[PDB]
């Protein structure tokens, strides 16, 4: 039911399709995780509502999300940070082949040490997702660079819906990734300078609005 | 869905007042909008700076008082035809104290636009299941502010649009056929950029461009 829900909305974004949703069928035959669908459309439409300009992002698999943020409006900069050597590559020769180059810089490396790299803007937008490495270290780091009423999206906050299933018996690993997602959304919404929300969509969405 | 409870949870820490009601509509078999859903427009309100809202369809005033507990400058009009409903929303209006921030407009929602066009609004809210939906967009859009927003609920009709063929029901067949034909209209209107969310019974947002 959930999955036919899904293919009919998604065909109903089929209309609004960019040049660069070709790409989701290279994430999908090669391993590759991209951003899901509704939830790229629904950020895309954040971006709109907020006037959000400058956007940091933690991780990448192939410079999709980069793109399709930077694909609303020429005056969109990202900043990406990503430490895998391959993902890294595919992201470069994406926003090469996609002339994107001007409005997304890779910086490459662990975001545990990227502060001094990335602070030369004040961003309008964070996107971290909750399972990826120390996620409650990185929302610390870098927060300090998000504008007020600016907006922290955090992915993932369901770990691909397993956070509630019997089935976590099956692998240690997502075990230990269940716990960091379930400890990260209790930290989360106990912040008091942020307003935050959770949506069911997808892999789980968060969204923090900074006070 | 067990994940669906594990979130409201999480939300337990933002309840209001009003939360009190979603109890009394379960028991009388009252719909009033989603819980997750109604968390992310109290958010969409914020992230606008909402001021201004209509609404079609009260019920018990639940969602139109989540929104005025936002801001004490929010104002909220919203219409509605029946009469038990009328009651519930008015009585609750008195007993939560928000008769200063909501108007009921009591009659047919084809019929209110001279009652509701005394204001430019910021956000609009319909069902796409309820009567005229794309009648509704049509007659009160041309209120909504450029860059304002209209925010669809229902437009997965509790699961029947994805395919109408597991519908039994000629009832629910006709349901689930004019909540297709909204949602395909609403993705085609050239001046209106709208994303849809298969959270809760689903929801379309929409920004007037």
Do not use: C
Not at 28 to 34: A, Q, W
């Amino acid at each position: 039911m959930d999955d036919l829900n899904k293919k009919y909305l998604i065909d109903l974004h089929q209309h609004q399709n960019s040049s660069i949703e070709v790409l989701r069928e290279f994430a999908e035959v090669n391993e590759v995780p991209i951003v899901d669908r509704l939830t790229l459309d629904l950020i895309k439409q954040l971006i709109r509502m907020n006037n959000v300009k400058n956007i940091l992002e933690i991780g990448t698999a192939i410079g999709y999300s980069s793109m399709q943020f930077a694909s609303i409006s020429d005056d969109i900069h990202v900043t990406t940070i990503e430490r895998n050597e391959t993902m890294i590559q595919y992201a470069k020769q994406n926003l090469a082949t996609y002339h994107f180059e001007n409005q997304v810089r890779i910086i490459e490396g662990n975001a545990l040490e990227q502060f001094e790299n990335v602070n030369d803007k004040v961003y309008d937008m964070i996107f971290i997702d909750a399972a990826k490495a120390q996620s409650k270290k990185f929302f610390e780091i870098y927060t300090p660079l998000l504008k007020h009423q600016g907006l922290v999206i955090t992915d993932n906050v369901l770990y691909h819906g397993f956070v509630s299933d019997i089935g976590i018996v099956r692998s240690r690993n997502v075990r230990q990734m269940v716990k960091k997602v379930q400890d990260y959304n209790e930290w989360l919404i106990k912040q008091p300078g942020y307003t935050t929300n959770f949506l069911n969509i997808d892999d789980g969405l968060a969204i923090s609005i900074k006070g």
